[PDB]
Design a protein around this ligand. Structure first.
Ligand code: FES
Ligand SMILES: [K+]
Ligand SMILES: [K+]
Ligand SMILES: [K+]
Ligand SMILES: [K+]
Ligand SMILES: [Mg+2]
Ligand SMILES: [Zn+2]
Lengths: 77, 193, 168, 54, 295, 119, 53
RNA sequence: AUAGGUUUGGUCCUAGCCUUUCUAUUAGCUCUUAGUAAGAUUACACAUGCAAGCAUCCCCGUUCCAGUGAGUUCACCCUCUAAAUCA
């Protein structure tokens, strides 16, 4: 792809991009769907983050992990 | 030529002619490839018959037109498998051309699939440690409230006609760049009569 | 033939037969042994036969050997906490010395099994990719799925060359 | 409600662990405060155009 | 109250284990496979008996009987019906959960149909997908043609019943319809043509006995055992029949007459056994021969 | 290759041969090439119907959740695949595209009917 | 392992950062607009069609 | 390597060279079809066209992808801790 330094093409100097025509009924319905959809996904994401964080903590300082560490120390002694 | 055994290929191997030509040795016992050097080329010739013309030193299969490589000619196929290990000899071993080695390999596999050729079938372990079918994955999941009532899983799947005030806002914002308003979609997918 | 006495010691098979995998605490192992005397034969045999096996299984543990510094042979292990484990090995055979250190400082067979199972999970059977990492390279290898175009040509209707010809 | 599949997987864990309950798993969306797309952003963290003049 | 023994009960397992037998030469028959130079050890008689004992232990693991399971019930559960998606896609999507550390029977495999219904995969689809992603050695995604009636009858003509059984165990799951069908059709052919020795000293004998006892056709097996001087096994077979059919004429007959040993065969032969006449003649011949050797 | 910024994304890496597409679901750095370095393979997607008339999708759901919980974004085609599986809600654009198709096909039935009726 | 110093790479870096602070364009220059062509003369970029009104 | 040819009038030993095998480029001569894969010798010089936009202005992106192999132990592990994603 082009770099910032590369010059712009002569053909594209006069090109103007026109936005698509908007359908009112479809536009509003779609906007709400995105709001609801993204709210549901954000809740799911939050739940997945909590699970990951909990698993890491459990491995680091979980009761079973600490118990194993103490058992290993006792066996060594 | 036209061999009379194409329909019943197994008959040739029990005929008198076969016993006079081959006896009890495999059909390839006497074949020797002609090549330069002491180490032979690691592939055999592609085909012994080109455009219905046979080459100078035809391979064991192509030199006799009555030997038909068929999944039913089990006695012929057995000659090309190791009795002690069950592996199909690679083509340089017997000297069959690549074309006939491919046909032999396919026929040997077809005979083994049909049960005509015996091969070692091992005793395998069970796939699963537990055979319980009580987990929800395989059992019936309690139906969700929306599924029982016939509603969409999430309410925003269904089309809800927007209020008129909101439609006016969009018609003000996109002045001069508006499409025909669309009503509620058809309740089910139509079909071309 | 292979050079040296007991050439078996210089084979990967022999070097992998060591059963002493030190716990992560062990950092240094100093082997003090005497070259002569009947009471030190086991230590001499332990240095001759078993140090190669121990080092092969514990590449990051420093093993240093000292000859004829003390009247009797002994082992000393320096742990990461700073504890020093002195193991007197006089009168013991090389087999006894090896079993003694496995008990006090060697990982048990359960600990080793677990580590090997964790390695199993690194390779997933379902994953597709190069043969170095995965069993199969493409889904086309799975029977029933559309074969590779290189082996079985695709129908003209499924090929882009003629998809756009039928349309235009 | 949880989506179809996730719901079925949470109910199966309950039964596998032994907990017998008929309550429906549901996502708490009260924490998620969905703001409008045209809400003023933080100008402090916004960048600036560079010096290259035409 | 009074539960009838299951196939995996310790009592049934002991009976069926002994009935099977242990021929070390058959269990460890030389396999036609890629070979390696054999190794040799200089062993004393004591050491030779210890190695033979270890072979008996290993052989008993190889003969461990597969558990007999009841036919799995078809899965027909709909997770959701998104009718909006109807008509959008022409082909169904099969989604397989490939999370490594999950028992294969606890995996969620669902199908999105073109109508929009998200349904759990059928037992057949479930097994096909597990092979696609967790391929098992000896299992094929597409059912091998060997299992067709015509192809299975050639295998029987060659006395390759054990081979048919090993193929079935590798391809099909123990509770699948195809699995149960094939084993049932193999067991029937053994009975019709009296080939019970083919499955002796194999892990498939117990299943064959279980099929015969629960379908009340233990006549052929009893005759063979007597003809082969296996009374202990024949008596145990009749005993087991009584335990699985306690409210039966033979069971009551043995109870009424307190029959034991050979008597159990006579009581069963007359009352319930279909071939009562043939059994008596066969049992008669044996008892006469046994009396001679005793002299 | 240390990129400037970027983020992890779960996306479809195109494999296969000409006219035989095959996708591998991979968690890769946003800036990495489509078919280049990836962090972890999370499934596969055969878009061609097989002999049984199935489009096969594998989803390592345990690891997909782990990566979404570590801040991995999602491509639109990947979000739509999880919607069809039922792991996420149906993406709004599949609903709208389904409705657009319904309207198109409903309009097609008028012209067809008129032709048969009028002529 | 001793990396050879690159002094010109650091000199130019400091000079650039400095010039970016002394020759920085003002909001008058950056956010100017020609109300006939509707283009920012600083960069010569057209505004989006939806903002023209 | 399962080896082979070659020192001499001849033998044995040692030894180099070469042969037979498998790939990749180029040359000569020759060449029907289909699918697929791969594809400047040169970090030498380059005509022409195109390869980065998006968007209610601000920002963001053009630091990516793509290319090359000139230079060359900057790539791996550990420790520590920026920027970045998780609104
Ligand atoms: S390697 Fe699978 S399509 Fe070619
Ligand atoms: K030589
Ligand atoms: K050429
Ligand atoms: K923008
Ligand atoms: K280079
Ligand atoms: Mg930070
Ligand atoms: Zn030939």
């Amino acid at each position: 792809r082009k770099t910032r330094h590369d010059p712009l093409a002569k053909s594209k100097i006069e090109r103007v991009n026109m936005p698509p025509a908007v359908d009112p009924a479809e536009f509003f319905v779609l906007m709400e769907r995105y709001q609801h959809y993204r709210q549901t996904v954000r809740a799911l994401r939050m739940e997945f983050v909590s699970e990951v964080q909990r698993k890491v903590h459990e491995a680091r300082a979980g009761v079973l992990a600490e118990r194993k560490a103490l058992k290993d120390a006792a066996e060594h002694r | 030529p036209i061999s009379p055994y194409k329909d019943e290929p197994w008959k040739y191997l029990e005929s008198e002619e076969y016993q006079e030509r081959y006896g009890s040795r495999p059909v390839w016992a006497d074949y020797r490839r002609n090549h330069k050097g002491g180490v032979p080329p690691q592939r055999t010739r592609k085909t012994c018959i080109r455009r219905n013309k046979v080459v100078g030193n035809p391979c064991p299969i192509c030199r006799d037109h009555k030997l038909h490589v068929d999944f039913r000619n089990v006695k012929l196929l057995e000659q090309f498998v190791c009795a002690h290990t069950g592996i199909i000899f690679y083509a340089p071993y017997t000297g069959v051309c690549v074309k006939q080695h491919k046909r032999l390999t396919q026929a040997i596999q077809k005979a083994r699939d049909h049960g005509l050729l015996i091969y070692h079938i091992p005793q395998v372990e069970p796939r699963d440690l537990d055979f319980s079918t009580s987990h929800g994955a395989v059992s019936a999941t309690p139906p969700a409230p929306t599924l029982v009532s016939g509603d969409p899983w999430y309410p925003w799947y269904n089309w809800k006609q927007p209020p008129e005030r909101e439609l006016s806002r969009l018609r003000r914002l996109y002045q001069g760049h508006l499409q025909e308003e669309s009503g509620p979609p058809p309740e089910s997918m139509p079909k071309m009569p | 033939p292979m050079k040296g006495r007991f050439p078996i010691r210089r084979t990967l098979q022999y070097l992998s037969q060591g059963n002493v995998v030190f716990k992560d605490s062990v950092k240094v192992m100093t082997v003090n042994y005497n070259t002569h005397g009947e009471l030190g034969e086991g230590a001499r045999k332990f240095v001759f036969f078993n140090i190669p096996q121990i080092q092969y299984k514990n590449p990051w543990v420093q093993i240093m050997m000292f000859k004829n510094m003390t009247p009797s042979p002994f082992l000393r292990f320096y742990l990461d906490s700073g504890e020093q484990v002195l193991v007197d090995v006089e009168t013991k055979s090389n087999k006894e010395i090896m079993e003694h250190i496995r008990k006090i400082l060697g990982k048990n067979e359960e600990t080793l099994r677990e580590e090997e199972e964790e390695k199993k999970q690194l390779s997933h059977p379902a994953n597709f990719g190069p043969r170095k990492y995965c069993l199969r390279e493409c889904i086309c290898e799975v029977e029933g799925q559309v074969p590779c175009p290189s082996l079985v040509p695709l129908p003209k209707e499924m090929r882009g060359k003629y998809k756009a010809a039928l349309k235009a | 409600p949880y989506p179809p599949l996730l719901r079925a997987m949470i109910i199966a864990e309950r039964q596998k662990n032994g907990d017998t309950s008929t309550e429906e798993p549901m996502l708490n969306v009260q924490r998620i405060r969905m703001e409008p797309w045209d809400y003023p952003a933080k100008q402090e963290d916004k960048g600036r155009a560079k010096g290259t003049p035409v | 109250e009074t539960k009838k023994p299951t196939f995996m009960d310790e009592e049934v397992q002991s009976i069926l284990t002994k009935m099977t037998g242990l021929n070390l030469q058959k269990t460890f028959k030389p396999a036609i496979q890629e070979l390696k130079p054999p190794t040799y050890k200089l062993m004393t008689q004591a050491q030779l008996e210890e190695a033979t004992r270890q072979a008996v232990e290993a052989a008993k693991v190889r003969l461990k009987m597969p558990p007999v399971l009841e036919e799995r019930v078809p899965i027909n559960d709909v997770l959701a019906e998104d009718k909006i998606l109807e008509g959008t896609e022409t082909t169904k999507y099969v989604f397989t959960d490939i999370s490594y550390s999950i028992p294969h029977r606890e995996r969620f495999i669902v199908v999105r149909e073109p109508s929009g219904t998200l349904r759990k995969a059928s037992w057949e689809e479930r097994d096909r997908m597990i092979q696609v992603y967790f391929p098992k050695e000896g299992r094929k995604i597409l059912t091998p043609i060997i299992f067709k009636e015509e192809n299975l009858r050639t295998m029987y003509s060659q006395d390759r019943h054990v081979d048919v059984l090993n193929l079935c165990f590798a391809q099909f799951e123990p509770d699948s319809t195809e699995y149960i069908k094939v084993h049932h059709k193999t067991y029937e052919d053994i009975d019709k043509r009296g080939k019970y020795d083919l499955l002796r000293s194999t892990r498939y004998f117990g299943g064959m006995v279980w099929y015969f006892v629960n379908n009340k056709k233990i006549d052929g097996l009893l005759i063979d055992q007597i003809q082969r001087d296996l009374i202990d096994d024949a008596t145990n077979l009749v005993q087991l029949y009584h335990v699985l059919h306690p409210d039966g004429q033979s069971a009551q007959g043995a109870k009424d007459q307190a029959a034991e040993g050979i008597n159990l065969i006579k009581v069963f032969a007359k009352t319930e056994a279909q071939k009562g006449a043939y059994i008596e003649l066969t049992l008669q011949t044996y008892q006469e021969a046994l009396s001679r050797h005793s002299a | 290759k240390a990129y400037r910024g970027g983020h992890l994304t779960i996306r479809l890496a195109l494999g296969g041969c000409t006219n035989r597409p095959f996708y591998r679901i991979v968690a890769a750095h946003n800036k990495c090439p489509r078919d280049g370095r990836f962090v972890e393979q999370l499934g596969s997607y055969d878009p061609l119907p097989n002999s049984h008339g199935e489009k096969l999708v594998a989803l390592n759901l345990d690891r997909i959740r782990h990566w979404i919980g570590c801040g991995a974004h999602l491509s639109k085609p990947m979000e739509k695949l999880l919607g069809l599986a039922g792991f996420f809600p149906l993406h709004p654009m599949m609903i709208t595209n389904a409705e657009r198709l319904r309207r198109k096909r409903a309009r097609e039935v008028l012209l067809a009917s008129q032709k048969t009726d009028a002529e | 392992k001793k990396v050879r110093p690159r002094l010109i790479a650091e000199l130019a870096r400091r000079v650039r950062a400095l010039r970016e602070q002394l020759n920085r364009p003002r909001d008058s220059q950056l956010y100017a607009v020609d109300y006939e062509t509707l283009t920012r003369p600083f960069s010569g970029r057209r505004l989006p069609v939806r903002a023209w009104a």
